[PDB]
Design a protein around this nucleic acid. Structure first.
Ligand SMILES: [Zn+2]
Ligand SMILES: [Zn+2]
Ligand SMILES: [Zn+2]
Ligand SMILES: [Zn+2]
Lengths: 80, 80
DNA sequence: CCAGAACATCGATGTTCTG
DNA sequence: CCAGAACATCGATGTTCTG
């Protein structure tokens, strides 16, 4: 049992730099899926929901904001 | 005077009087499924999300709770 | 009419592979 | 090493059916 190396968006076990920030493998494909298309989702609360290995599923909206705020960007850990 | 036409739990068009309250196809099933099944429903906000035709999938814990506040009951009968 | 079973669909996640 | 396709298995959800 590992000392956590925590994903900057959800606190679950990071897996490497993904799109510019340490993150587990789910935020990587979440973000990739988010940016490419229609992220018009709505918060059921007050635009500030907690996140954590269970609750990242609850609010897509907040999760997308947490990706942005932590610096994820597509042509990063890449090109120019 | 009373709203008859829409779901008491998510404001989607009701399908008849299920387990005690005017409701839709979904909250009916959801309700039974809540009570009987063992789950993990965890609010990510403050235990007061807006449950509606689209944010209802976001917090099932709050859907459940809205269902008990509104009157749904399992041993509750039939017949118009 | 309604409860409840069936059926079908949503989508997150995890793996392994290439370049 | 990361990006990003493929393809899998699930849990949660939701609609239409049949008694
Ligand atoms: Zn994460
Ligand atoms: Zn939120
Ligand atoms: Zn409903
Ligand atoms: Zn909630």
């Amino acid at each position: 049992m590992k000392p956590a190396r925590p994903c900057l968006v959800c606190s679950d076990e990071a897996s490497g730099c993904h799109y510019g920030v340490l993150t587990c493998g789910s935020c990587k494909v979440f973000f990739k899926r988010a940016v490419e298309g229609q992220h018009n989702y709505l918060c059921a609360g007050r635009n500030d929901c907690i996140i954590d290995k269970i609750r990242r599923k609850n609010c897509p909206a907040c999760r997308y904001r947490k990706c942005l705020q932590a610096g994820m960007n597509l042509e990063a850990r890449k090109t120019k």
